[PDB]
Amino acid sequence: TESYCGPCPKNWICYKNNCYQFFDESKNWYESQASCMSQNASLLKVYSKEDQDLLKLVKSYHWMGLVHIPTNGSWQWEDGSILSPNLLTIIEMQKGDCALYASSFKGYIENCSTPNTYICMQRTVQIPLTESYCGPCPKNWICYKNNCYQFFDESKNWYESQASCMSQNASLLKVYSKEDQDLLKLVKSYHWMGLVHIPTNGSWQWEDGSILSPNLLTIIEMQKGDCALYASSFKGYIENCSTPNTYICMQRT
Amino acid sequence: EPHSLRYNLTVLSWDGSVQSGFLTEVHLDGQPFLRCDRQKCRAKTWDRETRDLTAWGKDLRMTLAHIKDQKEGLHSLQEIRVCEIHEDNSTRSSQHFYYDGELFLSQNLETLEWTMPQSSRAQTLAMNVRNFLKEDAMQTDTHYRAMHADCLFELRRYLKSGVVL
Ligand SMILES: *[C@@H]1O[C@H](CO)[C@@H](O[C@@H]2O[C@H](CO)[C@@H](O)[C@H](O)[C@H]2NC(C)=O)[C@H](O)[C@H]1NC(C)=O
Ligand SMILES: *[C@@H]1O[C@H](CO)[C@@H](O[C@@H]2O[C@H](CO)[C@@H](O)[C@H](O)[C@H]2NC(C)=O)[C@H](O)[C@H]1NC(C)=O
Ligand SMILES: *[C@@H]1O[C@H](CO)[C@@H](O)[C@H](O)[C@H]1NC(C)=O
Ligand SMILES: *[C@@H]1O[C@H](CO)[C@@H](O)[C@H](O)[C@H]1NC(C)=O
Ligand SMILES: *[C@@H]1O[C@H](CO)[C@@H](O)[C@H](O)[C@H]1NC(C)=O
Ligand SMILES: *[C@@H]1O[C@H](CO)[C@@H](O)[C@H](O)[C@H]1NC(C)=O
Instruction: Determine the Cα–Cα distance for residues B71 and A115; give it in Å rounded to an integer.
Output: 43
Query: Three-state SS for A56?
Result: helix
Cα angle for residues B73, B75, B80 (degrees, 5° grid): 170
CB A42 within 8 A of CB A122: yes
Q: How many residues does chain B have?
A: 165
Interface size A-B, in CB pairs within 8 Å, comes to: 61
Q: How many residues does chain A have?
A: 253
Listed by start position, the domains of chain A span 3-123, 145-250
Q: How far is CA B70 from the centre of its chain?
A: 25
CB contact set of B57 (below 8 Å; sequence gap of 6+): B9, B11, B22, B24, B38
Q: Which of A108, A190, A237 lies nearest to residue B146, judging by beta carbons?
A: A108
Listed by start position, the domains of chain B span 3-160
CATH class of the region B3-160: alpha beta
Instruction: Determine the Cα–Cα distance for residues B127 and A245; give it in Å rounded to an integer.
Output: 29
Ligand minimally distant from the alpha carbon of residue A113: 4
Strands A89-91 and A62-68 turn out to be unpaired
DSSP H/E element including B115: strand B113-115
Query: Three-state SS for A2?
Result: coil
Query: Three-state SS for A103?
Result: coil
DSSP H/E element including B12: strand B3-14
Say if ligand 5 is within 6 A of residue A213 CB.
no
Q: Which fold has domain A3-123?
A: Mannose-Binding Protein A; Chain A (3.10.100)
| Residue A5: closest CA among A186, A118, A131 | A131
Q: Could you tell me which chain A residue has the CA closest to the CA of B48?
A: A104
Say if ligand 2 is within 6 A of residue B25 CB.
yes
Say if ligand 1 is within 6 A of residue A82 CB.
yes
Best mutation target, B58, B60, B68, to test chain A (most A CBs within 10 A) = B58
Instruction: Determine the Cα–Cα distance for residues A109 and A30; give it in Å rounded to an integer.
Output: 15
Q: Could you tell me which chain B residue has the CA closest to the CA of A57?
A: B55
Q: Resolution in Å, one decimal, please.
A: 2.8
Cα angle for residues B100, B103, B107 (degrees, 5° grid): 135
CATH architecture of A145-250: Roll (3.10)
Instruction: Identify the experimental approach.
Output: X-ray
Q: Which of B19, B66, B138 lies nearest to residue A220, judging by beta carbons?
A: B66
Distance between Cα A64 and ligand 3 center (Å): 21
Measured CB to CB, residues of chain A less than 8 Å from chain B are 59-61, 91-94, 100, 102, 104, 108, 116, 188-190, 220-224, 231-233, 235, 237, 240, 243
CB contact set of B70 (below 8 Å; sequence gap of 6+): none
| Residue B36: φ, ψ to 5° | -105, 160
CA distances from A31 to A28, A179, A243, B141 (A): 5, 26, 45, 21
Instruction: Determine the Cα–Cα distance for residues A52 and A46; give it in Å rounded to an integer.
Output: 7
Instruction: Determine the Cα–Cα distance for residues A110 and A91; give it in Å rounded to an integer.
Output: 10
Q: Which of A61, A232, A237 lies nearest to residue B146, judging by beta carbons?
A: A61
